[PDB]
């Protein structure tokens, strides 16, 4: 038996809910013209950073694999993405400037967000193909 | 040879991070005085509905043993309840009627949604436990 690769995926599975979690919140909070949601989400908000970060410490030394470091890779620049246009959103809003953050919205931080999920979405696909096919090879042992 | 306990651990995976997603969703656009929401979160909320509706017809039959079905039948009852309260709080903001919106949200719904977060959770450590032991060699 060999379930480290099973705890990889269950690392994956968590961050992607994790991080799916996040960007239904954020998308949510970011076209919203209401500035207290911020506020009434913000424990709420926090549990899944500490989620996020206590899941993610933990898978990232574990991609070791070309086609997983790639697909990490391409998660970091955008989730570098991700939450610089969330804030310009923010920031935007704030400072009067509507036209500009909704702009903003729909040209940066959506294909941001749509983009980490999709990449998050591949990883736990490769994952889940590795656990099968490294299951179907430990079944020569008949 | 242990293919459903995989099966029901990635099932009810997909089923948590499903409900997550849609009970993040629902919290925001309940709070959030911007009727804009509804409609601009429309197609991602009918993709998480699409997909938990698939998910829930795959996971339910498999759920038999006593722990499981004890935890299962506690989610559709409190699922019930965050349903109704869901429903209530989107006709009072819909009435013009967004203070007794806002104590109905606080008072009925985030109780709901949080219990039927806790047994969602509750159900996949089960599962996770049951096929770490179906790993006898």
Redesign the interface.
């Known amino acids: 038996?060999m379930?480290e690769p099973?705890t990889k995926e269950?690392l994956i599975?968590d961050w992607?809910?994790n991080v799916?979690?996040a960007v239904?919140?954020t998308?949510?909070?970011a076209?919203?013209?209401?500035a207290?949601?911020v506020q009434?989400?913000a424990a709420?908000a926090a549990a899944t950073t500490k989620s996020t970060a206590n899941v993610l410490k933990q898978i990232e030394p574990l991609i070791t694999q070309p086609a997983e470091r790639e697909i990490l890779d391409k998660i970091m620049q955008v989730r570098k993405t991700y939450i610089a246009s969330r804030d310009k959103v923010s920031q935007l809003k704030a400072d009067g400037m509507a036209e500009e953050a909704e702009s903003t919205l729909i040209n940066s931080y959506v294909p941001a967000a749509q983009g980490y999920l999709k990449l998050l979405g591949e990883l736990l696909n490769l994952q889940?193909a590795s656990l099968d096919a490294k299951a179907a090879e430990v079944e020569q042992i008949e």
Do not use: C, G, P, Y
């Open positions: 038996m379930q099973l269950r599975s992607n809910s799916s979690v239904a919140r998308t949510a909070i076209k919203s013209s209401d207290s949601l009434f989400l709420d889940r």
